[PDB]
Structure formats: structure tokens, C-alpha cells
Ligand binder design. Structure first.
Ligand SMILES: O=C(O)CCc1c(C(=O)O)[nH]c2cc(Cl)cc(Cl)c12
Ligand SMILES: O=C(O)CCc1c(C(=O)O)[nH]c2cc(Cl)cc(Cl)c12
Ligand SMILES: O=C(O)CCc1c(C(=O)O)[nH]c2cc(Cl)cc(Cl)c12
Ligand SMILES: O=C(O)CCc1c(C(=O)O)[nH]c2cc(Cl)cc(Cl)c12
Ligand SMILES: O=P(O)(O)OC[C@H]1O[C@](O)(CO)[C@@H](O)[C@@H]1O
Ligand SMILES: O=P(O)(O)OC[C@H]1O[C@](O)(CO)[C@@H](O)[C@@H]1O
Ligand SMILES: O=P(O)(O)OC[C@H]1O[C@](O)(CO)[C@@H](O)[C@@H]1O
Ligand SMILES: O=P(O)(O)OC[C@H]1O[C@](O)(CO)[C@@H](O)[C@@H]1O
Ligand SMILES: [Mn+2]
Ligand SMILES: [Mn+2]
Ligand SMILES: [Mn+2]
Ligand SMILES: [Mn+2]
Ligand SMILES: [Mn+2]
Ligand SMILES: [Mn+2]
Ligand SMILES: [Mn+2]
Ligand SMILES: [Mn+2]
Lengths: 311, 311, 311, 311
């Protein structure tokens, strides 16, 4: 099948009585996603991807007539869109996430978060410094064995799979919700020596259950998009906390943490730094970093009560 | 590029003065691999994959006229090929590996190992009970953001990437070699409570280097073909040792362990149980399990040395 | 590349200050075109096309929220769109033209013509009975060795080629214009015995030039879309006049003749029945037939002066 | 379906007790055909085709180790294959036929005929100067709304359609036979002034049946592979006789006429100059031209009888 992404976003646009700008925005982004997907599929045949990916996303978004401020992980500064092409939305994105693993055939992905412009002064970088709680839509595309587009908005999370015979995204999972409790923990344990006592304690309880509990299985792809998507569909928890390398975490607030935290929350899951909901952090820099812990609410909660006890 | 998989195996057949049977076998397999790839890419759009995958591999292999005995993970007993279609090769395969992960859009794969039939009596299940050291060829296809086919034989290991525009696998890396030393370890730490003392000590050295040498990074996708591929291309070590639930290990010797062990050894790596080369084990059952440790020669050796000390 | 059809129609929408309905309409139609294109490409692999084609076009157009009255060559009656999905445009189309030749691998095509609704009473079949001169846009998709979408509007004719790696139409020829004079005539000469004296005379002058003129070459694919597209890009003339079989011609006014006549005229060519401009005919039946003669203005004019002389 | 082209030629090689050389030759050719297909499908998106096509065919053929002498329409002299790569087959081909029509999105194609080298002296251009009757195999690929590969050999003619999802040609019609009598004639009537008297009389009988039998319908795409394919599948007759500009005809004997004549005869049709079987002509030059008349046995015979009467 019935539903294409195009059909779905238009029907949501009309149900919310929008102008249609969102529908242009998402239709454009879908074009860049398809192109990134085919380029990653033929990467080794060539004759940088993240530079081609960045330009694809930038151009299609500029030409959607739906945006005014763009933040890319690949650009030092926020891009302020030409007046002629200006629309009302602010888009934060990571055009090609996990690209230290394109070489290892690793599910990589594009991550985005969309805001309605704040003020009415000339659009500026400050318009992208909004808490994640003001997101109107967010999601990611996962370039894997299939190309999948996960989109979250006020009414929930929907999963769309790229049909390569026609170049359209087909709705395959409506209203996704994560399990309340999972049996998988995901973290890079090579940082063991730098982990705080809370994380250290939780990791230990996962592995040495106070007996007779089966231990959780461990998974860590090393690409956020793959690890978050597994967490969404099969449940459990994902962690990239602060360590010594970065005592503010590694992952980026605006276009890595917020978008995943917004999907998680709309699926019925949680997302926190250990001390506050990721979505209520107010950024001060467009490239700011945040620690993140996200996943099924029972597991996330368990970890947050370890944080509380140690405090 | 220059070289299609079709051209490469023909060239290799002639250099080896073969009958061409191995060539029809590899070309047939290739058709099954392209078909699996496409079905995984549009799996959510459907309207089991490992049943369809099993059938694809069985069919193209029977019809290649190159094979007499087939062992699949999905079948209780070996399939004996009808006389009219028999050729001389014994093929052991895992048609769709990592299928607990298709749901989480995760690199899954096809694993195969090819034997020359042993005897001259009627072909039977016993013809597949050969040590890995007698392999003529082995490899895997990895269904990821790109489709890769890795093929190892006496002259080395070669990597081919699927060009979806023409349905041909293109040679993208000739004579692949693993790095002598890596910096990544891969294992499900979820089983820590059941790990033997040597694995326990090696893991702790990887996270708390004695030395003020940087800790190894951790990765574990949970699909063998993804984990072995990353090990092959970036180096380090992959481990699936025996634990409690599996005192003989989890992974299958004939169609998971041997192929990967063969690929590794041809790439200049190592592959051991902790006590003997996986490729010298003589299976006693077609679905036998074996513990396995494989990867860069320095990392694996280092582990072997700990086993030695604890003995 | 620079320009996608999607980019192009939106930029035309904004230059004409439209509501965006046209852009939804054309984006939807583009989806059905891609699907028809892949289904015709794999037709023989199956496991009727014009029934699948008709439903594709109908559904995507209904769901565009841009249409109120649909006329298909495959439906007896005009389809009046549900109030909820109603938009202002009336679409006439031939979903799969030339389908007595899918069997012969013949370039077949989809043909459409779009009108703005006339009245304000409830939308009805009468809203599709407009002269071709009221068209706001028209064109065709040609399923050939490449899939091409030719779109004509007030500022001209543009040609877009389907990029199968990303499922987008890329602008490859802007502002197409036909040659003033061609050297090819296209007609089914098997109807010789039924042709009027005007057509008979013109055919004879093409073949037996009053000497020293090179004769025109003859071409007739038997699929309007292929024959018109050749006429557009290389010039010359195309004829499907009245005969005895149908003394009103064979081709359909609303969704075969008008659309081709509108493209021709916007390319700088002509289109007539022999007695009046096709575009000024006012239909009386949605399935009405018209004789048509179209192509480079010098050739069309020559034929029309043969008609005048015989009158 | 059951049968891929790869499987079918292997099966046929074994039944014929071949060396496998013809099998590598056909598989190689197949790769060139898939590549040409894709480049024609995205030709307008570029950023000459017959130069690229020439190079594709030459390269895959040289690298098949199956060939010693190559005749292409695009090369002055025969290409003699380097000793290391030589095999026993002589291949005559038209890499991209109908290329005056790519511009008008029109079915174009690859035509090939394969000979066994004659002598034992050094391979040379003379090895290609064999009557069509010595063909071992011939056919064509037709790049249209679908890509088809038609392959004829001693056991008959077979049609394969390209499945773009897996890059394999699938057997869709086994043992193809032309109808004994058709109802379509195909010829460029643009040359009527230069036609011999027998062709003139046959054309007039087709349009004004003596009999009150329905006139034949006319078709002429202007690309031989398209016209011969329609003739093969629906019946009737295709004609390219000598005229003034070409007193020996236009079409090329070795790589246009012979292959089509071979396909036709294997399908139970006929192929003549008007005076002898095209397949019994002995070429005197690699780029020799021949007049040709081919198609259903009743239609062709009927024409032959008129030639007889006028003699
Ligand atoms: O915040 C808004 O009002 C825009 C949200 C929106 C619109 C719209 O306002 O037009 N249309 C949509 C379609 C999808 Cl799928 C998702 C969202 Cl959030 C939307
Ligand atoms: O020893 C033999 O019988 C052949 C080995 C072989 C053949 C063949 O006989 O056709 N084809 C091959 C392709 C590759 Cl990649 C590797 C080998 Cl050993 C081969
Ligand atoms: O007749 C009209 O006003 C609609 C024409 C139109 C619009 C619009 O009004 O919004 N947008 C377009 C885009 C393209 Cl490509 C072509 C046309 Cl006719 C159009
Ligand atoms: O006579 C021969 O040498 C073989 C004929 C042949 C071969 C082969 O030798 O490999 N392969 C074929 C494929 C087809 Cl479709 C037809 C023929 Cl005759 C063949
Ligand atoms: O190697 P590390 O430090 O575990 O980091 C891996 C993480 O970094 C990234 O590669 C880059 O953001 C993420 O996709 C992933 O979650
Ligand atoms: O969940 P576990 O015990 O870590 O098992 C993972 C292993 O199981 C499999 O999915 C199937 O054998 C392998 O691909 C993978 O390496
Ligand atoms: O066979 P005829 O009578 O020449 O008609 C062919 C014409 O009919 C159609 O097949 C059907 O509309 C057209 O595509 C084409 O122009
Ligand atoms: O224009 P003409 O003389 O009818 O020539 C058409 C012929 O020329 C070619 O395009 C090239 O030989 C053939 O495919 C076709 O049959
Ligand atoms: Mn990035
Ligand atoms: Mn990133
Ligand atoms: Mn399996
Ligand atoms: Mn398995
Ligand atoms: Mn029709
Ligand atoms: Mn029609
Ligand atoms: Mn040519
Ligand atoms: Mn030619």
C-alpha cells in the first residue's frame, strides 16, 4: 505494499494541516538518501563519500524550499540558506555516520533532526541551538543489507524500506515501539579502564547475574545507526557514556544524540546522559558532545538508578 | 574494472588445468548469491529467507553438474546428488548466516567450503567428513551496505564486490592479506561468567594493557561473516570459544569454522581451537561444533601462549 | 546532472505561483511511471500489464490530492475522485499505449494530458470534455532502451531520463524544438487502399520526388509514443488519418491525440486532422477518436496544402 | 524461473561434449551485453556508445580465451587475438546496431555470429570469410523496454530476458519457431523508386490483395534487430533488398545478415537474397554487403516465386 513514504508524509501533512513544506523537505531528503545508498553500494567500484554525502544532503535540502538553517557534522559553521530558497525548518544532520567502517562493509547511516525556526530575525546558527524536545521530526536512514528509513514525529515511529526496483520507500512497520525490557547491552568495553563506577557496576551485573538470571548478550557494531536500530527492533540498551577521551562523551548532541533520543522516546523508550533526559539539554555549540544511554525503559531505568545510588 | 568473478575463475581454472567443473560450480553459486542479495534487500517488502536461501543454493549447485554431496546447515542429512547431475565436488554451506539479525538490518552472509570427493564408492555423507586442510576453495558472501564475495583458494584470497547495474562481481582487492597485528578484539562478553581462564586473562590484557599501550577497541556484530570480514580487512581477533551452553563451542565446523579458518590461513592469519589448528580437526558429524579463535597472527599467537601457560 | 524532475517542476511551480497541487500530481505520476517501467522490463519473468498500469496510474493520482476527474483509456466512464482526495485537475491518460507490442519488445508508453477543472458544480465527465488548447501540461513516458519522460507546459518541452540507480528522472534536454523540416514520413501504408486522395498524393511525392530530390525515409514502429518521439527528436511527419476501419481515425482525442498535439505545438511543430488544428477540437465523448497529422511545420503544411487543393 | 543463460549453455556444452570454450565465450559475451544494456539505459545521463560498445565486446571476447579472430563492424580489419589468449572461435559482430536511433529511444541491439576456425595456419582475416552455413551459433541482444538475448545453435533458437535484479538472463521461450505465414511486411518504402520489379509487385499485392483477403499491416522500426525480432515472434517478412544507393544491399553479410539468417532458419523461417540462401553466400570481404529477405516460409517463398517469374 500500500504505502510509499511520499504517500505517508502527505497524508500526515494534511492531517496536521501543514503548508506542505515538510513534505517537500522529506521528499528531497529521500532523494539524497537513495543516492547515498547506491553510492555506498558501489563504493569499491568508484573508478570521499562523506563529502559527496554532505553535498547531496545540502543541495537537495537547499532546493526543497523548506529550510533556512542547516547544520552538518561535516561543516564548521551552520549554513544559512539563500533568501530565495528559504523555508521555515532548521535541519541538523549527520550525512554519513559510521564512515570509519565503509571499508568493513558496515551498516552506516544518515541521521537527521528537524526543527521549526525559533525567532523571526535573520535565520542564524542560534536557530539550531534548540533542545531536542522541540523536534518536529527525526530519524535516520540505515545503509545495510537493505536500505531502511526510520522516521519519528508526534504520532510515532515508522520504518520504510527502499524498493530498489522503483526508487521508493515502502512503509513496512507502522507505529514501532521498543520492548519494555531487552536482553542485549551494547557498549565499547575497550574503554573499561576509563568508565565511571556506575557504568562499571551495570556492566558487571549484566555479565555475572546474581544467579540464575541468564546474562544479557553483548553486541556493538561500532556504527551508531546500526546499534540504535538493533536496539529499537529487538530491545535492550545502547551506551556511549563519558570516558577520559571525552568527558562530555563522543557522540554529537545536535545530529547524533537528539535524533536517536527523539526516535527512542517516540518508540516508548528512554534516552539520558546518566543525569538528565538528552532531549532537555539546551546546546551551546552546534558541534557539542553529549554522553548517551538509550533503549528499553526497564534497562535504561536500571542504569539510572545505579547512577542515583552512586551519587 | 578489468576483472569479473566469471573471468577470474576461468583464468584460475585454466592455470590449474582443471576440467571446468569448479568453474561451473563457482558461476552457479554466484547466481544464488546474487539472488539471495536481492531478496535480503527487499525482505521487508515481501508482500522464511533461510528456507528460500537454502533452496537457491541447493538448486544452483545441483544444476551445476559439479557436485555429488551437499551439506547445508538447514538439512539434517547430507544431500546426495542424483547420478545424472553429479560431478566431483563436496560442498558444505551455510546459506544464510546471522539470520537472527535480518530483523535488525544487519550484515548476514553465505558461507561455503568446497571439497574434492574422497573415495570412489557411492557418494555419501562421509565424503563431507574431511579435515578443512583438504579444502579446494572456500569463502563467503556478505550481504551489507554493499554485497561482497570473498573467495580463497591455493593462491590466496580475493574480494569481489557486486555491481548491481550488471549483476557481476568485480575484483576489488587481489591477494588480500590480514595485518600481522590488530587492535580490535571481538567476542560476546555476555558469556564472561562461563569463559575459561585463558580467555578471561586475554580480555583483561586487552582492556588494561600492562604497558600503557593503548587498549584494543571492542567490536562484535553478532553475525560471523560480518565479524570475520572486519577482522580480515582491519585486523585483530575474533573469538567464539566454548562456554557452558556450548562446551564444544557454538559455531559449526564444516560450514562456519572451516571456511573462515581457510580464508584466514590463506590471508596469512591463524585459526585455532585454543589447542589445535581448526583446519586439522577431523569432523565426526556433519553438524559438529568447534570453538574458534582467528585473526592476526600476532594477536592469535598471544592468546595461544596464554592457553599454554594455563595448561 | 543538476536537475531532477522533482526539482524542475517545483521550480516551475514557484515561478508560476502555484499551490503545489501540480507538483504533487506530477510527483505521483512519476511513481507510477517508474513502477510501469520496471514491470515492463521484467514482463516475461512475471512468474495483464495494462490493467496493472491502469491501477497504478489511478491510485497514485487519487492519492496525489491533486485531481477530481480521471479519464483512462481502460475505463468506460470517467472516474470522479472521492471528495476527501479531490484537487482541481482533470487528467486524461492512456496508461499503457502500444500494448499489442509488449510481446515484440516494442517501445510502449504512457500518455497524459492535464486540465484545470472547468466549472464549480460537482466534478463530472463533462469536466474532461475540454479542447486541447486548455491543457496546462501534457507529455508521455516512453518505456524503451531507456525510460524517458517528455513533459510540455506553457514554457516548452523538456525531456527527462529515468536514472535506474536512484529512481529519479534527470533533465537531459531542456526546451526541445522540432526541426522545421524533416526527411522521414511515418504512416501505416498497409491501409493504402483505404487512404483518401490527399494522403495518397503526399505519400507518392515522398517516394517519387520530382527528381533530384532525395526521397524521405519511411519509419513506422506501430506504437504512437515511439513514433511521435522519433518525430520530435529527428523531425518529419507522423500520420494516422481516417480510413475505412475508422472514418474518424483510430487514435483517441483526449489521451492520445491532444497530448501529442500539445507537445508538438510547444516544440514548434503542428498537429491537425487535415481540416483543423487537433487542439481546437471540442470533444463530445471521452473516448472519441480523431484523425491526426503532426510533425515539422514544413512537412505538415505541405500535406495540409494537398488537402486544400483537393477540397 | 528455472533456467539462467549460464545454466543453459553449460547444459548444452556437456550434451555436445565440448571443451567448454564456447561456454566461456557465451558467458563473456553476456557480461558485455549486460554492460551495454545499462549504458544505453543511462546514455542521456552520461555526464560514443558504439565505441564503448565495441571495446566492451572486444575485451570480454579476448579475455574469454575462446577466440582467435574478431570481426567488428567498427574495425577496418579483423582483430587477430594475442597467442596467449587465443582459443578456436571466430566471432563476427555488430556491437551496437541501429545507432542512428539511440537518439530516438529506439530498440537497438548487438548482433553476433560464431565460427569454428577453419585452417591451422596462423589465424587471420580469411578465417572469417566462411559461408553462414558454417555457423556454430549466432544471435542478438535487443536493448528495448526489456533486454532480450536470442540465441540460435544446432538444436534451435532460444530467447532469454535480462532480470536486472540479479544480472542474469532467464530462459523465457525455448525452441522458438516462426509462424509459417505472417500478416506484416517490413521494408523502407522510402526507396520505392529504386526497387526492382519483383519487390514492387509483392508490395502492391500486400496492400491490394487480389482476393479480398485483408491487406498485410506495415511495420519498419529502422533498426534490424527490432524488425527481425518482431518478425521472429509475430511472423511475416523483413526486407532490405538492393536499391540504387546500395546495389549490393545495405546490411552487412558477416555480422548483420548471416546471424539473422541463421536465427531465422533455425526457427523454421527462410532467408534469401532473392536469388540464393543468404547462408550459402561466401563472403569475399569482411565488410561485404548483401540484400536480404527473411521471415515466415510462406511469405518469403511467395516473394521468391515473383522473382522467379520476372527472371
Ligand atoms: O510541525 C509541523 O506543523 C510540521 C509537521 C508535519 C507536517 C506539516 O505541518 O505540514 N507534515 C508532516 C508529515 C510528516 Cl510524515 C511528519 C510531520 Cl512531523 C509533518
Ligand atoms: O584442479 C582442478 O580440477 C580445477 C581447479 C579449478 C577450476 C576448474 O577445474 O575448473 N576452476 C577454478 C576456479 C578457481 Cl577460482 C580456483 C580453482 Cl582451483 C579452480
Ligand atoms: O495552471 C497552473 O497554474 C498550474 C501550472 C503549474 C504549476 C502551478 O500552478 O503550481 N506548477 C507547475 C510545474 C510544472 Cl513542471 C508545470 C506546470 Cl504546467 C506547473
Ligand atoms: O563442439 C563443441 O566444441 C562445444 C559446443 C558448445 C559448447 C562448449 O564446447 O563448451 N558450449 C555450448 C553452448 C551452447 Cl548454447 C551451444 C553449444 Cl554448441 C556449445
Ligand atoms: O570506536 P568507538 O569509540 O566505540 O565509537 C564508535 C561510535 O563512533 C561512531 O563511529 C562515529 O560517530 C558512531 O557511529 C559509533 O557509535
Ligand atoms: O549470540 P551469540 O552466542 O554471540 O552467537 C553469535 C553467532 O551466532 C550466529 O549468528 C549464527 O551462528 C553467528 O553468525 C554469530 O557469530
Ligand atoms: O496497427 P495500426 O493500425 O497501424 O495502429 C498502430 C497504432 O495503434 C496503437 O497501437 C494503439 O493506439 C498506437 O500506439 C499506434 O500508433
Ligand atoms: O534507413 P535505412 O536504409 O532503412 O536503413 C535501416 C537499417 O540500417 C541500420 O540501422 C544499420 O544497418 C539497420 O539496423 C537497419 O535495418
Ligand atoms: Mn559523519
Ligand atoms: Mn557521526
Ligand atoms: Mn544459517
Ligand atoms: Mn549459521
Ligand atoms: Mn492503452
Ligand atoms: Mn492507446
Ligand atoms: Mn553498428
Ligand atoms: Mn550495424
Amino acid at each position: 505494499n500500500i504505502v510509499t513514504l511520499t504517500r505517508f508524509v502527505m497524508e500526515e501533512g494534511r492531517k496536521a494541516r501543514g503548508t506542505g513544506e515538510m513534505t517537500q523537505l522529506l521528499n528531497s531528503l529521500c532523494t539524497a538518501v537513495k543516492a547515498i545508498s547506491t553510492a555506498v553500494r558501489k563504493a569499491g567500484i568508484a573508478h570521499k563519500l562523506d563529502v559527496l554525502s554532505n553535498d547531496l544532503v545540502i543541495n537537495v535540502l537547499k532546493s526543497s524550499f523548506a529550510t533556512c538553517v542547516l547544520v552538518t557534522e561535516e561543516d564548521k559553521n551552520a549554513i544559512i540558506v539563500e533568501p530565495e530558497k528559504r523555508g521555515k525548518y532548521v535541519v541538523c544532520f549527520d550525512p554519513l555516520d559510521g564512515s570509519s567502517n565503509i571499508d568493513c562493509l558496515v551498516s552506516i547511516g544518515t541521521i537527521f533532526g528537524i526543527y521549526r525556526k525559533n525567532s523571526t530575525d535573520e535565520p542564524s546558527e542560534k536557530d539550531a541551538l534548540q533542545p531536542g524536545r522541540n523536534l518536529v521530526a527525526a530519524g535516520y536512514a540505515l545503509y545495510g543489507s537493505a536500505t531502511m528509513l526510520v522516521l519519528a514525529m508526534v504520532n510515532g515511529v515508522n520504518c520504510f524500506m527502499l524498493d530498489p526496483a522503483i526508487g521508493e520507500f515502502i512503509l513496512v512497520d507502522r507505529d514501532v515501539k521498543i520492548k519494555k525490557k531487552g536482553s542485549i547491552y551494547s557498549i565499547n568495553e575497550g574503554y573499561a579502564k576509563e568508565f565511571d563506577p556506575a557504568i562499571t557496576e551495570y556492566i558487571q551485573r549484566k555479565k555475572f547475574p546474581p544467579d540464575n538470571s541468564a546474562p544479557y548478550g553483548a553486541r556493538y557494531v561500532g556504527s551508531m545507526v546500526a546499534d540504535v536500530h538493533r536496539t529499537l527492533v529487538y530491545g535492550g540498551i545502547f551506551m556511549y557514556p563519558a570516558n577520559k577521551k571525552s568527558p562530555k562523551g563522543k557522540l554529537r548532541l545536535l545530529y547524533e544524540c537528539n535524533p536517536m533520543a527523539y526516535v527512542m522516546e517516540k518508540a516508548g523508550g528512554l534516552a539520558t546522559t546518566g543525569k538528565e533526559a538528552v532531549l532537555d539539554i539546551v546546546p551551546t555549540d552546534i558541534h557539542q558532545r553529549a554522553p548517551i544511554i538509550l533503549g528499553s525503559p526497564e534497562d535504561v531505568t536500571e542504569l539510572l538508578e545505579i547512577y542515583q545510588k552512586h551519587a
